[PDB]
Amino acid sequence: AVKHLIVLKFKDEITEAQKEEFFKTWVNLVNIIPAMKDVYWGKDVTQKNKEEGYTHIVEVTFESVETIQDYIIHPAHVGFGDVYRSFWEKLLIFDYTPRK
Amino acid sequence: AVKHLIVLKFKDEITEAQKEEFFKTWVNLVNIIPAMKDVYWGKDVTQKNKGYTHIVEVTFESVETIQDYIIHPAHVGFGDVYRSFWEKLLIFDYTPRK
């Protein structure tokens, strides 16, 4: 089991309603993309690193790093990326297996 | 329910064994700090940004109790011994939702 983590900042012109619609859409992909096992998102409330600007976190769960590729190329995901391409300003991506 | 997320890069001289001992020590705080409910960590394998190499997720009951962890004597000691290990970090606190 691997987590695909995204840390993101939206463009300034994007409204809160748009952001919530964006995340709803992303969460709803789980239903239609077999490789996606789970999605959670959240807004940062502490703002400990404002100079960096990142505001939101998204966690997508996969059975393996391998199967992330099946999600990346799935038509529903490609379409999601196309539709919302104007929304994001910058992001960090991480893939890891959570452990103790 | 809130997640206290740390994105971290270590100093270059820090060895892999040192990193694993660092995370072992951090994980073992859960037992000792009432506010800490759970911890996981992991190494990024994709390395697509460039930068940050490790992720730590600490689980809390609320944003308010994160402070109880921050000032807990076990956590203060942990920071005193190991803060020199890291080069830079990003911190995020959020309620994971659908």
Side-chain angles (χ1 to χ4, degrees):
Chain A
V2 305
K3 187 166 294 186
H4 180 72
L5 179 80
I6 306 87
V7 183
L8 62 163
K9 176 181 174 203
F10 292 90
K11 294 275 190 47
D12 286 338
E13 59 274 18
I14 305 301
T15 68
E16 281 292 279
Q18 288 183 298
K19 296 171 199 192
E20 304 202 321
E21 200 282 336
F22 169 93
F23 290 116
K24 195 179 79 171
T25 302
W26 201 342
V27 166
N28 281 325
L29 286 177
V30 175
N31 325 132
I32 56 180
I33 305 186
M36 296 182 92
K37 301 303 182 180
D38 214 344
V39 178
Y40 287 87
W41 65 274
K43 186 181 178 151
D44 169 58
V45 294
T46 298
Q47 287 151 68
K48 223 76 162 168
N49 314 106
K50 312 203 61 182
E51 80 278 358
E52 293 293 338
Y54 302 99
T55 52
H56 288 78
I57 304 296
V58 177
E59 316 170 29
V60 189
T61 298
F62 293 95
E63 273 184 290
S64 73
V65 188
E66 302 183 57
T67 64
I68 297 174
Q69 189 55 32
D70 298 324
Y71 151 85
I72 291 296
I73 51 75
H74 193 287
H77 173 258
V78 174
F80 173 71
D82 286 347
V83 169
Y84 293 102
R85 157 158 308 110
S86 60
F87 272 41
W88 54 270
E89 182 175 292
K90 61 172 175 177
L91 48 79
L92 295 170
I93 306 304
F94 303 99
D95 297 300
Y96 61 95
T97 301
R99 52 171 307 179
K100 301 232 197 307
Chain B
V2 312
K3 187 167 294 187
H4 179 69
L5 179 80
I6 302 95
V7 187
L8 193 59
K9 178 181 173 205
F10 294 90
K11 295 274 188 45
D12 287 338
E13 59 276 17
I14 301 300
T15 69
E16 285 295 280
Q18 287 183 299
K19 297 173 198 194
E20 304 202 320
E21 198 280 334
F22 168 93
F23 292 121
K24 198 182 84 169
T25 302
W26 203 342
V27 164
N28 277 321
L29 286 177
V30 176
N31 322 288
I32 281 182
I33 305 184
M36 296 182 92
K37 300 304 182 180
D38 213 346
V39 176
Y40 293 86
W41 63 275
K43 183 184 176 152
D44 169 54
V45 296
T46 299
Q47 288 143 67
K48 63 162 38 206
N49 311 306
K50 318 135 190 141
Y52 305 99
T53 57
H54 286 77
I55 302 297
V56 178
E57 317 171 28
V58 186
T59 301
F60 291 96
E61 283 174 291
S62 71
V63 190
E64 306 185 324
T65 64
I66 296 176
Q67 183 53 215
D68 295 324
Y69 152 86
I70 294 296
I71 48 75
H72 191 286
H75 174 258
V76 174
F78 171 68
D80 285 346
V81 171
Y82 294 103
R83 73 179 162 242
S84 54
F85 271 39
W86 49 264
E87 180 179 291
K88 60 173 175 177
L89 49 77
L90 296 173
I91 307 303
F92 301 99
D93 299 300
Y94 63 98
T95 300
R97 46 166 306 180
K98 299 230 196 305

